Ligand binder design. Structure first.
Ligand SMILES: [Ca+2]
Length: 122
């Protein structure tokens, strides 16, 4: 009974984290923010995931706890940061920090991937 799951692409994580941060900072309810990010996704799997995260949130779970249903997508640091914002009343600010982080991660990582590819078939 071995299982294996992969997360999402670094740009896909950057997009959904930016969108969530944007919506939460505009003052819309968290559950409605999760709905909009899901409904705006081009990726069926991400829609399904965020529907599922939202479903746990509506059943009373914190965002951090709900994201822990997808540990292969949101790592311990990401979830820890969310948990910190929620425990402290600064989810809005932590999501902004997570969105900036994920964006810079995507950019840096994409560069390396591209440079690797560039040099290889040179
Ligand atoms: Ca920023």
């Amino acid at each position: 009974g071995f299982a294996f799951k992969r997360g999402i692409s670094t740009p896909d994580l950057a997009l959904i984290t930016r969108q969530l941060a944007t919506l939460v900072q505009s003052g819309m309810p968290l559950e409605e923010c999760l709905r909009a990010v899901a409904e705006q996704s081009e990726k069926p799997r991400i829609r399904t995931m965020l529907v599922a995260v939202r479903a746990k949130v509506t059943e009373g779970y914190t965002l951090s706890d709900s994201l822990g249903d997808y540990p292969h997508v949101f790592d311990e640091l990401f979830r820890s940061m969310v948990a910190a914002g929620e425990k402290s009343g600064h989810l809005d600010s932590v999501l902004e920090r997570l969105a900036d982080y994920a964006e810079n991660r995507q950019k840096m990582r994409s560069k390396l991937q591209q440079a690797s590819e560039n040099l290889y078939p040179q």
